[PDB]
Scaffold this active site. Structure first.
Site, PDB file in Angstrom:
ATOM      1  N   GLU A   5       0.825  -1.202   0.000  1.00  0.00           N
ATOM      2  CA  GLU A   5       0.000   0.000   0.000  1.00  0.00           C
ATOM      3  C   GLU A   5       0.872   1.271   0.000  1.00  0.00           C
ATOM      4  OE1 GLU A   5      -3.046   0.292  -0.622  1.00  0.00           O
ATOM      5  OE2 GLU A   5      -3.993  -1.637  -0.118  1.00  0.00           O
ATOM      6  N   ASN A  23      -7.600   8.149  -5.983  1.00  0.00           N
ATOM      7  CA  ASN A  23      -8.358   7.068  -6.610  1.00  0.00           C
ATOM      8  C   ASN A  23      -9.120   7.618  -7.816  1.00  0.00           C
ATOM      9  OD1 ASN A  23      -9.059   6.201  -3.208  1.00  0.00           O
ATOM     10  ND2 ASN A  23      -7.647   5.091  -4.575  1.00  0.00           N
ATOM     11  N   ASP A  50     -12.259   7.517  -8.411  1.00  0.00           N
ATOM     12  CA  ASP A  50     -13.513   8.122  -8.030  1.00  0.00           C
ATOM     13  C   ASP A  50     -13.336   9.522  -7.450  1.00  0.00           C
ATOM     14  OD1 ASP A  50     -12.660   7.568  -5.425  1.00  0.00           O
ATOM     15  OD2 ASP A  50     -14.361   6.341  -4.886  1.00  0.00           O
ATOM     16  N   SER A  54     -11.669  10.197  -4.594  1.00  0.00           N
ATOM     17  CA  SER A  54     -11.241  10.054  -3.224  1.00  0.00           C
ATOM     18  C   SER A  54      -9.727   9.890  -3.192  1.00  0.00           C
ATOM     19  CB  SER A  54     -11.956   8.893  -2.575  1.00  0.00           C
ATOM     20  OG  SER A  54     -11.551   7.648  -3.094  1.00  0.00           O
ATOM     21  N   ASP A  77      -6.396   8.058  -0.808  1.00  0.00           N
ATOM     22  CA  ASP A  77      -5.939   7.119   0.210  1.00  0.00           C
ATOM     23  C   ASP A  77      -4.755   7.723   0.954  1.00  0.00           C
ATOM     24  OD1 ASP A  77      -7.747   5.210  -0.978  1.00  0.00           O
ATOM     25  OD2 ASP A  77      -6.181   4.779  -2.433  1.00  0.00           O
ATOM     26  N   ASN A 104      -9.060   5.294   2.940  1.00  0.00           N
ATOM     27  CA  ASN A 104      -9.772   6.041   1.909  1.00  0.00           C
ATOM     28  C   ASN A 104     -10.656   7.137   2.508  1.00  0.00           C
ATOM     29  OD1 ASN A 104     -12.413   6.041  -0.120  1.00  0.00           O
ATOM     30  ND2 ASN A 104     -10.393   6.032  -1.059  1.00  0.00           N
TER      31      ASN A 104
END
Ligand SMILES: [Cl-]
Ligand SMILES: [Cl-]
Ligand SMILES: [Cl-]
Ligand SMILES: [Cl-]
Ligand SMILES: [Cl-]
Ligand SMILES: [Cl-]
Ligand SMILES: [Cl-]
Ligand SMILES: [Cl-]
Ligand SMILES: [Cl-]
Ligand SMILES: [Cl-]
Ligand code: NA
EC number: 3.2.1.17
Length: 129
Positions: free
Chosen positions: A35, A46, A48, A50, A52, A59
């Site tokens: 990650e 991301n 969409d 959003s 992280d 998120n």
């Protein structure tokens, strides 16, 4: 902060992630590696819209507030910037809520694609824990 592998393992153990909801410590170390590369300051956007945040790439759609994710929840009740701290407490406490939400560690895409089904004990080999 960029953690060492065994350093991070020990911090995660102290915070009670070892066998939390049945996931052995190596699962958590493996997830963090893929990650964030063990970097608390990691951020990634991301598709969409959003973002992280932090060592476990939590998120903003569901878990933290970053002020720029419409229609998003803040189920960990934290600003997303708190997840970038050298102190992993906020990240760990929020991760415990995520992993308890029904889908286990499958919530972390990189865990499912890179760690699940592998010898995750390798990630803690050599560490004094
Ligand atoms: Cl280390
Ligand atoms: Cl490594
Ligand atoms: Cl396990
Ligand atoms: Cl393990
Ligand atoms: Cl805000
Ligand atoms: Cl927002
Ligand atoms: Cl922006
Ligand atoms: Cl919320
Ligand atoms: Cl810590
Ligand atoms: Cl599970
Ligand atoms: Na949010």
């Amino acid at each position: 902060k960029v953690f060492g592998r065994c350093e991070l393992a020990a911090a995660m153990k102290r915070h009670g992630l070892d066998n939390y909801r049945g996931y052995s410590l190596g699962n958590w170390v493996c997830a963090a590696k893929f990650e964030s590369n063990f970097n608390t300051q990691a951020t990634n956007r991301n598709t969409d819209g959003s973002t992280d945040y932090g060592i476990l790439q939590i998120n903003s759609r569901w878990w933290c507030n970053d002020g720029r994710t419409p229609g998003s929840r803040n189920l960990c009740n934290i600003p997303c910037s708190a997840l970038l701290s050298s102190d992993i407490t906020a990240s760990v406490n929020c991760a415990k809520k995520i992993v308890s939400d029904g889908n286990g560690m499958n919530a972390w895409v990189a865990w499912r694609n890179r760690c699940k089904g592998t010898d995750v004990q390798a990630w803690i080999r050599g560490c004094r824990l």
